[PDB]
């Protein structure tokens, strides 16, 4: 179908592809001469013909791959129909001919690029696919399923009564490959098509599940694991599809995991399938107690699979304190029980867990005593809600094992004590320190093996983190004397841990550590003056100690310590310890650090200026790059993540330096702003970099301010790029930071910091964020969002901040988004309602009584919201009613006092932590109506005190100050009057010196002192500094 002149040219080019001189003369010719609007048709026709008919493996394979790549970007839509027909028929004829397996796979991928909505129907393929699925050649059946995987719309095109038995045949096919293909294509259907199409194939799930036992019979464990991996994807998509046969799939995975003659992939995948149900259908897992029973049982079984053919754990005692990467099932079981526990809670999991725990701790199989410990460790956080009250029993179980004959069981017991010290904190620190500390300290002796000593030491880090200095003080000497011994170990990882443990004990001990400084600091210096990590940890310990004891004590060794830092710095995990130590020294020395900036900042400036580092890569070289954790890929794009992670790290340090040194950091602000902060916003392939750039902007500005054309110019530049990001930023979480960064920027720059160009572009940004938020939330048979509540919470802030800096002028610009706002107000979902209510509350403050245009548009919805079951909605509503009578008295007269009845009702589970906030706003709103325009004033009084909402408390008490300066004055409510004030002051909600001498006037008209006989010593001393 091609001129022989063209064939030989292109054949030379494609053959040239596998050979650099001959090679890229060819791909330059391909890229510049043949991928053109005049040659693309010829080029596609050629490659299709080569892949279909060439008997050279290489050329056929290459052409099929090239065709796939090129058919996309042409795109196939703009190809003349008569060549598309030519390309289709030849690909199809090549597919139905005699080809190698891999080539038919590539033919399949090529064919798939010739199927589309846009494109003319291709009934020849559909007919070809159906006859191919019935073939005796597995590769024909496999390739057909593969095509249906790429283009699952085709499953719709075929008559249902043909496609269904095809899949049922596929699930039970004699070939493993075909089966895996069938399962992949089946799940792929749900991956690509709308949910309204799912019920067409959903009925095939029991057929699939019934096919699974066959894999165990044939001993096909790896094919089973592949099928599990597809089923796991299906559980994330349509968990409820598994409802009716939940028991059998639960019992099947149980059966697979218990069969420990199988290779790990079958059993780890099986466990993941179990696990994933808890993450996608928890109500379903909870409604069936056979699930939890099975999940607990099998994870426990797998956690016993440690130190196989090594009962002494000799290999474990001799190795360092890292994980054995070979104990795969053990590790998988730990993470699994953790994930499920976090999803289902202790009310469901604790009982079946402890049924086994009771039993396993007593076994002679040390591996089961070990496994019991690790299992409790994994489930503790997620079962915390329950286990936090069963804490002496847990310790009664665990603590006796701390001297188990087997050192790996001891280790396990140290693990639990450490783990629950985190998960049950701070309550376990306050109530079990007399048991946990002596148990851990006892394992520090050189009687125990290195591994147990070290892990006991690690557990002490966990405990310390939430133990107050007063709790630790009587244990400090014992702790340290022991740790000093660990410090003299010949085993490096023991020393390293000892240092870290001392450090974080010191951090918790604070000024209680001062008496230990003299004994420790020399031992540290000797370590440093002599193994990179050791020094890094030793430098960390030294500076954490320094921060604990304070500047004065630290000054005894600071300059020597600094000189050693300098030596270490200018001589990869070490660099992180050093950077953090520098930053901690800055916290300690305060302003005295400033001469050290020329040493500390330039390394950071380099790392923080890192460019995004991205190489656009081919689809084959895609996974190839992602083996390494420091690289990720998402045309295809290879990003170097760690380089950008370190970019964020450096920016975070620059942040803290800027924050600590304030004005002393001004000299860097311009550079950091223009070269680092602002460019970071354009980093569209790394979320963290963008957020770090944003948070940096207000803190940079405050530095320069504290120490002007520069300041104003940089703010104009930074605000504009922030504002400009609101309409481009796809990530809602990042969007929130931008608004928050604008609030703080505005707060720094002050009054009228925005031009009305910016005020306009800000409004377009807000509307775009609101529009996209609405659509994302406007979205069951198959299935059972705080990120967006938070975004809307800061949009409230920025609008409020912008209103304040414009001193009202932004009312004009906000007019254009009220239809958006109004939609939100009436909407079902409380999140959108709360947002709107807060906005309207801010509007009236600057737009009362400018808002008569809006009055009857929101008040009908506001008055409903008053009685709403959601406290958040009542509060925001009560506030609006209140601010109506405060800033727009006469425009809202006909509304405020009719609602004065409802406020008196809502005002009375009201005085309770959950809704204490809501009822104080209503209390405030009542006080506002009473002020603006009399049984109500006495009703409002016993809503006092106001102790949570500060804005609300502020008004209520100088309404109280003005009511006197009737029912409040004289009388015998004088003890309730005073106490109403004392409570607000003491609770730090009340601004009140207005009211204090209003009270002092009343006490003069009397018995005066006896009113304070109620209050204890600590509150009385505050009273005396008050009156």
């Amino acid at each position: 179908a091609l001129p022989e002149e063209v064939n030989r040219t292109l054949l030379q080019i494609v053959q040239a592809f596998a050979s650099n001189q001959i090679r890229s003369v060819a791909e330059k010719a391909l890229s510049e001469e043949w991928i053109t609007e005049n040659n693309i048709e010829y080029l596609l026709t050629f490659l299709a013909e080569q892949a279909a008919f060439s008997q050279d493996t290489t050329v056929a394979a290459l052409s099929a791959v090239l065709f796939r790549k090129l058919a996309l970007k042409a795109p196939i839509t703009h190809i003349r129909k008569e060549v598309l027909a030519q390309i289709r028929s030849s690909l199809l004829k090549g597919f139905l001919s005699e080809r190698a397996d891999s080539i038919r796979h590539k033919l399949s991928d090529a064919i798939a690029e010739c199927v589309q909505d846009d494109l003319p129907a291709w009934p020849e393929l559909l007919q070809a696919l159906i006859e191919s699925l019935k073939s005796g050649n597995p590769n024909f059946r496999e390739s057909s399923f593969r095509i249906l995987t790429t283009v699952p719309y085709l499953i719709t095109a075929v008559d249902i009564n043909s496609i269904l038995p095809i899949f049922q045949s596929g699930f039970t096919d004699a070939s493993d490959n075909v089966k895996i293909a069938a399962v992949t294509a089946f799940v792929g259907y749900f991956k690509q098509l709308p949910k309204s199409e799912w019920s067409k194939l959903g009925i095939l799930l029991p057929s699939l599940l019934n096919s699974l036992p066959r894999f165990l019979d044939d001993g096909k464990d790896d094919a089973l694991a592949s099928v599990f991996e597809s089923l796991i994807e299906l559980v994330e998509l349509a968990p409820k599809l598994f409802k009716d046969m939940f028991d059998q799939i639960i019992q099947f995975t149980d059966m697979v995991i218990k069969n420990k003659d199988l290779e790990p992939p079958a059993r780890t995948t099986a466990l993941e399938l179990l696990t994933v149900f808890s993450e996608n259908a928890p109500q379903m897992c909870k409604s069936n107690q056979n699930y939890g029973q099975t999940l607990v049982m099998v994870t426990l079984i797998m956690m016993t699979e440690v130190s196989i053919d090594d009962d002494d754990a000799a290999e474990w005692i001799e190795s360092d304190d890292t994980d054995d990467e070979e104990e795969v099932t053990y590790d998988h079981a730990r993470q699994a029980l953790d994930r499920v526990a976090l999803k289902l809670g202790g009310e469901y999991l604790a009982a079946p867990l402890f049924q086994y725990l009771q039993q396993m701790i007593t076994s002679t199989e040390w591996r089961e005593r070990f496994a019991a410990m690790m299992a409790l460790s994994s489930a503790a956080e997620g079962c915390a809600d329950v286990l936090i009250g069963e804490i002496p029993k847990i310790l009664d179980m665990v603590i006796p094992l701390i001297n188990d004959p087997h050192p790996r069981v001891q280790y396990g017991c140290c693990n639990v004590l450490g783990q629950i010290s985190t998960d049950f904190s701070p309550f376990i620190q306050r109530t079990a320190h007399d048991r946990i500390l002596p148990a851990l300290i006892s394992k520090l002796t050189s009687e125990c093996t290195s591994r147990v000593q070290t892990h006991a030491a690690a557990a002490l880090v966990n405990f310390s983190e939430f133990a107050s200095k007063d709790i630790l003080e009587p244990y400090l000497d014992s702790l340290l004397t022991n740790l000093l011994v660990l410090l003299q170990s010949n085993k490096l990882y023991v020393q390293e841990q000892a240092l870290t443990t001392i450090a974080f004990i010191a951090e918790a001990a604070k000024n209680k550590f001062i008496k230990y400084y003299d004994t420790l600091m020399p031992l540290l210096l000797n370590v440093l003056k002599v193994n990179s990590v050791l020094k890094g940890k030793c430098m960390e310990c030294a500076t954490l100690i320094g921060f604990a004891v304070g500047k004065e004590k630290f000054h005894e060794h600071s300059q020597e310590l600094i000189s050693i830092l300098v030596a270490l710095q200018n001589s990869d995990a070490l660099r992180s310890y050093l950077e953090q130590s520098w930053s901690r020294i800055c916290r300690i020395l305060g302003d005295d650090f400033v001469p050290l900036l020329p040493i500390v900042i330039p390394p950071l400036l380099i790392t923080a200026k890192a460019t995004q580092d991205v190489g656009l890569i081919e689809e084959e070289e895609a996974a190839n790059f992602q083996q390494y954790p420091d690289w990720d890929v998402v045309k295809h794009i290879a990003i170097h993540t760690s380089v950008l992670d370190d970019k964020v790290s450096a920016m975070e340090l620059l942040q803290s330096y800027a924050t600590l040194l304030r004005g002393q950091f001004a000299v860097y602000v311009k550079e950091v702003m223009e070269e680092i902060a602002l460019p970071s916003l354009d980093f569209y392939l790394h979320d963290g970099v963008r957020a770090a750039g944003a948070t940096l902007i207000p803190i940079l500005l405050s530095c320069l301010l504290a120490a002007n054309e520069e300041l104003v110019l940089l703010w104009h530049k930074a605000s504009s790029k922030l504002i400009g990001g609101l309409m481009s930023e796809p990530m809602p979480e990042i969007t929130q930071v931008y608004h928050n960064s604008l609030v703080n920027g505005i707060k720094v720059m002050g009054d009228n910091c925005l031009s009305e160009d910016q005020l306009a572009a800000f409004t377009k940004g807000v509307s775009a964020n609101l529009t996209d938020t609405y659509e994302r939330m406007q979205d069951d048979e198959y299935n059972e969002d705080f990120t967006d509540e938070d975004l809307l919470d800061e949009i409230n802030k920025s609008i409020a901040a912008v209103l304040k800096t414009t001193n009202g002028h932004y009312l004009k610009n906000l007019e254009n988004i009220w239809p958006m706002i109004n939609t939100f107000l009436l909407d079902n979902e409380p999140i959108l309602v709360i947002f709107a209510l807060v906005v309207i509350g801010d509007l009236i403050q600057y737009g009362g009584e400018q808002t008569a245009s809006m009055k009857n548009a929101f008040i009908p919805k506001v008055t409903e919201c008053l009685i709403s079951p959601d406290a958040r909605i009542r509060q925001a509503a009560s506030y609006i009613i209140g601010v109506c009578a405060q800033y727009a008295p006469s425009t809202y007269a006909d509304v405020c006092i009719p609602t004065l009845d409802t406020l008196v009702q809502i005002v009375d589970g009201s005085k309770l932590e959950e809704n204490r906030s809501s009822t104080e706003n209503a209390s405030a709103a009542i006080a506002k109506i009473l002020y603006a325009y009399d049984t109500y004033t006495a009703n409002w009084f016993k809503t006092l005190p106001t102790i949570t909402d500060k804005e609300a408390a502020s008004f209520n008490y100088q309404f109280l100050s003005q009511l006197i300066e009737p029912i409040v004055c004289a009388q015998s409510n004088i003890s309730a009057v005073v106490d109403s004030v004392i409570q607000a002051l003491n609770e730090r909600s009340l601004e009140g010196q207005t009211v204090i001498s209003s009270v002092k006037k009343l006490l003069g008209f009397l018995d005066a002192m006896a009113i304070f006989n109620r209050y204890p010593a600590d509150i009385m001393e505050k009273v005396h500094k008050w009156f």
Binding site: D323, S378, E381, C414, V461
Partner: peptide, 5 residues
């Protein structure tokens, strides 16, 4: 210290 994987 002690963490979960």
């Amino acid at each position: 210290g002690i963490y979960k994987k």
